[model samples]
Structure formats: structure tokens, C-alpha cells
Target chain A: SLADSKAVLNQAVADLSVAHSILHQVHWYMRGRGFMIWHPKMDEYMEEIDGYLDEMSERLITLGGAPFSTLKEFSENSQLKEVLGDYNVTIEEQLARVVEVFRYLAALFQKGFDVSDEEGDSVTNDIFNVAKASIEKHIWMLQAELGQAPKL
Target chain B: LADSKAVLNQAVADLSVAHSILHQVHWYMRGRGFMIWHPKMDEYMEEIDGYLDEMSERLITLGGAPFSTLKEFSENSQLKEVLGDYNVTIEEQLARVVEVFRYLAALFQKGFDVSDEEGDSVTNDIFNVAKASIEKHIWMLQAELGQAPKL
Candidate 1:
């Protein structure tokens, strides 16, 4: 059961690392109105993501599992794709892509929730739930920015 | 629910201003230990921003609108904001940061109490985490000033 939970969490480590990479792309290539605010906001988002990645990886290690750290591991194992940053894209398109990535993360964390619950790993399950709440909040805000309703 | 929402929104306002105050400290810092303290200000601000983002979202989830703009922050937040100047001693600027944390530490306590009253353990847990981190920073910052945290 512990191994099963670790498997989900390590995959989490992989997917979260990729999520961080994707957000970096959004940060570096974003343009248009509110760039001033959104620019540093990206860095803030990165900082928060860094916090999550570190906390989850630490959680995995505390359970006696090795966490992935290399770009190769992140790229190869991540369920999310890292797109090349393109300056030509509309701000809406860029952020829409980001929301999609958040969607992937929400789904990933859901799997984490289900597996951790099945394994009776309450600690990991609670952590996954908190992470899900955080991303869902961002999902709400980003979707609102993109003129979509907060469907959640 | 209303009380917790209010406290959460209050934190959103205060932390936003505190984030700006940290920018003042970051840019105007001079004297010894600039290398260490300067970068830490951004880290501190990042922590503040993270709290704001989380708190504002929580507020929205509870059907409250956050104090969302610069003007709203100015109106709702009473924390002091200093004009940046190269002449300000690093210690004085850091003092301002300590002030920011002290204010936030108190706000977090208030939030914790209100969340408790609302029977909202999740919001209370958030206040618990932020306050613990702020208190630790307060200890280190006061130590930086060659003083004890006046607690």
C-alpha cells in the first residue's frame, strides 16, 4: 500500500515538475495588457509551485522513496507536455494553455486522492486534497480571466 | 462564515500592502548585510503574496469579494508605507518589515479565532501555518537587529 501511494506521489513529483516548467514558459513569453501585474504574478505562482514540489517530494522521501529531480525524468515521466514558449501567441491563448495544464494537475491530484484513499494513506491523501484545493482556486481565477465560468 | 470571510479578506488587504512595503525595503536597503537581507525581502514578499492569493480565493469561495485593486488595498490596509530612499538604514527598513510581520501575525490570530468561531478548521489551519511562519521570521528578524523578539 505504501508503495502504491509512493508510486502516485512520485508521479506527482514528475507531473508537478513539468507543471513548473510550463508555468515558466508562460511567464517568459506572456505579453499584452496587465503584463506588469501578471509578470511578477507568474514568479509568485512559480514560488508557490516550488513550495508544492518541494513539500510533496519531501513527503515522498519521508516515506522512503526517491524523488525525481532531473529535467529528463520530469520530461519523460510527466503526464503534461512542455510547450515551446512562443511570443506570437495571444495572452488569452497562453493562459488558456496554462488552465489546461492546471486541469491536468487537478486530474493528477484526483488520481493521487483516489490511490491514497485506497491505500489508506491518510497523510498523503490530505496533502493531495490541499494541493487540489490550491490548483482549483487558480483554475477558478484563470478561467474567470479567460471569460469562462468557475465550473467547479 | 461571515466573520471568517471578513478576516480572510482583511488578511488579503494587509498582506498586499505588506508585499509593497517589502519592495520599499528591497529597493532602498543600504549598509551591511545587503546581500543576505535584500534577497530575503523578495522571499518574504513572495510568502506574503502566496498568502494573499490563497486567502483571496478562500474569500471568494465563501462568497466574498476580495479587496482586489491597489486602491482597495490602500483603503483597507493601514500598514505604513515608506518612500524608498537609499539613505534609509537597512536596519530601519528591516524594522518596517518586522512591523509588517507583527501586524500580519496579529491578523492571523484574529483570523484563527474567527475561523474557530465559524467552526471552520480549514481556514484555521491556514492561519496556523501563516502565523507560525511569520512568528519564525519575526524571531530571525529581531535577531538580525541584535535584539530579541519583544514577545
Candidate 2:
């Protein structure tokens, strides 16, 4: 059913919105050696995720589904684990936290792809395709930031 | 010559032309989301700049000289150069950047295929990573205009 795709997208919106909020928390509260490098990165990642929300939500709208827009809706639907930002959680840990969340996102997008395929919704399938590509790159780039490899 | 060299050089040229296209988008875009799209252009270009350098360095590693000069890039580039205009909407600017990424995405796919054909795992890895990243950009940018990714 198309409803399945819509549900997946709204779930993504919730997760991505909360994920963006988590980045904001990290952006404001965290400080350390990579502050010069990692600070602006949070902005880039935040805006980047908003595009995902914009895409998924608008895509939902186009499909005659009511996109989740309110904070309450997003919080309820999101699948990501929310951790309060802590000064004691080292910058490395925050970076790792980003990697972990994005990994979860990658999995969610893959699920979107599978359900969209079964439903014959090519447009949504392609959306998840593109989303997964970006998600993989994020994992690679973030992993590299944490002294790991691109792992491609 | 490694066929991969040709693919990498084309990417080098395409990316070089893309940077200017983005600059025109940056300079010409006005009204509604200017604050966001303006700096977003800088971030986008910085990313392409890094990709350009990586491809060029890899080409050099493989004993091929990248199309380094403006004239060389102009001659080799597969994408259109952005002409300047001030009246274009932000929607139009967004489309142009998507086109650029789309072109590069194709080039990276070619990079992936040709490198694999040559059994060059290293070069293949580079293109594989880039292809995924660029497609993601295409979707996000398309969403910016309330559009789905064209492909």
C-alpha cells in the first residue's frame, strides 16, 4: 500500500528531525580539540538533514499523505535514540554518536527502498536509493573523522 | 593509456566547470532562502573542490596529467558553463546545481565501470564512494525545490 511508503517517510522525517536537533545540541554544548573543524560541520550536517526532511515530507504531501510537521509528531515517530549533550562526553564520542545515528538512518532508508519496491512506487524507491548513497558517504566520512577508514 | 585516465580527466574538467556554475548561482540567486542557499553554495563548491583535487591526484598517481588549465577544462568539460543573470529565481539556481551533480554522478559511474574493467580496484573505490555521495546530493537538492530526483 502507498500508505506503507508514507509511514516510512514520516518515520524518516521524525528520525531526521530529531537527529538534526541532536546535532544542534552537540553544536551548542560540545567543545574540544576539533572545535575549529567540527563546529561548522554540525551546521552543514544539520542543513543537509533538513533537506532529507523537506524531501520526505514534501514527497509525502505529493502522495496525499499528511506529512508529520509538528515537534510532537516527530518525537513520537522517530526511531533514533536521543541522548542529551554532555560536556563530559568527549568530542570523539560525539562524532561516534553521529556515526551511530547515521548508521541507523542508513538502515531505515534501506527499509524504505524495500517497501517502495514491493509497492511499485519507483519514485519513493529512488528517493531511498539517493538517501542511502548519501548515508553511506556520511558513514564513511564520519568514520574517517574518527581515525577510521573510508571503508568503501 | 589507462581508460580510467580518460574518465578521471573528464571528471576533473567537469568538476572545474561545475565550480564556476556554482559561483554564478551564488552571485545570481536572490530572494527567499538567500541566507541559506548563499552559503550552501560555498559548502557545495568546497566539496567539489575536494573531489577535483582527489581525482587529479589519482590521475597523477596513475601517470596521467589532469586537464589543468582553464582552457583545457573548457575544452574537455561535458557540462554547460553557467552564464550570469541576476533575475533568476532560487528554484532555477537549485536546478542548475542538481544538473551539475547529475553530470558528475554519471561520470563517476563511468569511473566505476572503466576502473573495474581495468581491474583497478583503487580507482574503482574512489568512484564508488563518489557516486553514492553525489546521488544523495541530487536527491536532497531536488527536494529543495519540491521535486523528486529526476532519475
Candidate 3:
């Protein structure tokens, strides 16, 4: 049971790490009239994501699982799409790409949520709940900018 | 009282226009990545409908009835609807969407400033939230076109 939970937690960490990297890429390279405002907002979001990653890591450690911390581990485990900041692209393309990342994350959380629920791990389930809600909020805000509706 | 409500009505009208635009685009969207983007557009339309619902409720709370008919939205809003043939490419569709974001962003900024002056903090807050999101859209949309807006 602990092993299963550990796997789930690590996967979450990996996904969040990928999200963190992409957010930083978008924050730094994002251009247009929205740059100044949105650039700072990315920092705030990355900070929140950092908190989630830490929480998941600690939980995994407590469950007798070694938390993966290296870049290689994150790259190998994450399903989130990664894009280089230097890639020449429009703000819309970048934004759409990030939104897709959130969509993937939302789905990932759902699977994790199901696992935690079935395992009778209320604590982990709660963690997923908080993380999922935060992810959804960010997605909604991003979607609003795209003139799209909230999917979460 | 009048200006505050007027700005709010404009916001309501603008969102309705957005709702209409998304529906038309979603209906006719095609080309490469259409399968990927079409479902996303559907989600976008649903979300705008949600926004329209909230804006309508806010207007009603302010003792005003928001525009209900499609004709009212097209006539009152500053933004334009995009209705063209189905032969358009993804790049074309994306460009059109970005144009709408610019229009909406300008309208939202105006509404936010007016609300601030009108001493309608709630309405002002709504405008800021909406505008911030629009700015993000513009940033992303511009990036998609390989054009970067000046910081």
C-alpha cells in the first residue's frame, strides 16, 4: 500500500516539476503588452507549485519511499510537455501549449485522486484535493485570457 | 449610478459578443490540428457561457437587466464577430482569435478605469481580473504568431 502511494506521489512531483519549468519558461520569454504583469504572476504560481512539490516529496519520504529529486528523474517521469524558452513562437501558441499542460495535469490528478481514495489514504487524498484545486484555478485564469471557458 | 451600470452593461454585452465569436469559430474551425483545437474551442465556448451567466447575475444584482438577445450583443458590443468560409487555416483562425483578444482587452481596460472613477470597486475588481486574463491571452497569441509585443 505504501509502495503504491509512493509511486503516485512521485508521479505528482514529476508532473509539478515539469509544470514549474514551463511556467518559468513562459514567464521569462513571454512577450507582448501582458509581459510585465503576467511575468510576475508566473513567479507567484511557481512559488505555489514549489510548495506542492515539497509537500509531495515529504509525504513520499514518510511513506518509506525515496523521493526523486534530480532533473533526470523529473524528465523521465513527467508527462507534461516541455518547450524551450528560446523557441520562436507566438504568445498565443505558448499560452495554448501551457493550457494543454494544465489539462494533462488535471487528468493526472484525477487518476491520483482515485488511487488515494481507494487506498484509504485520506491525507494523500487531501493533498491531491488542494493541488488539484490550485491547478484548476490556474487553468481557469489562463483559459479566460484565451477567451475560452474554464475546463476545471 | 448610471455610469456604473452602463459600464457593467457594456461588459455584459462584450462577453456576449465573445460568446458569439467562439461559437462561430468553433462551428467552422478546420485544418491541421482542428481535432485538437476544436474540442478546446468547445470548452472555451462553455466557459464564456459561464462568464455571461455571472455577468448577467451581477447586472441583475445592480438592479439592471443585461442584454438577453443575440442581436443586442452584436449591436451594443465594440468587438466584431468572425464569420467566414470553412477553408481557413489554423494560423488564420488563431490570428482572428488574437484580434478579438485585443479588442476585448481594450474594452476591459476602459471598463476597469470607468469603474474605478465611478467608485464601483466590485465592478472595478471584475474588470481587472478580466483584463489580466486578456493580457495573458494577447501575450500567448502574439507568441503563437512569432510576434512579440513590446514589454
Report the lDDT of model 1 for residue A88. Answer: 87
lDDT of each: 0.83, 0.83, 0.77
Residues B7-67, candidate 1, lDDT per residue (tens digit)? 8888887888888888888887889989999899889878888898878877775557788
Question: Chain A TM-score per candidate?
Answer: 0.94, 0.93, 0.91
Provide the global lDDT of candidate 2 against the true structure.
Answer: 0.83
* Reference-based lDDT, residue A1, model 2: 52
Candidate 2 Cα deviation (angstroms), residue A82: 21
Off by over 4 Å in 1: A1-152
lDDT, candidate 2, B1-151, per-residue tens: 4799999998998899998988888888898999999998999889889889998999999999888799999998877674599898888879878877888877887787788789988888788777756766776787788886765
Candidate 2 at B113: error in angstroms?
Answer: 0.2
Clashing pairs in 2: none
Give a tens-digit lDDT track for model 3, residues A118-138. Answer: 888889888888888888988
Rank by TM-score (best first): 1, 2, 3
- TM per model? 0.55, 0.54, 0.54
Please tell me which predicted candidate would have the highest TM-score against the true structure.
1
Judge candidate 1 at residue B142 and give its lDDT: 98
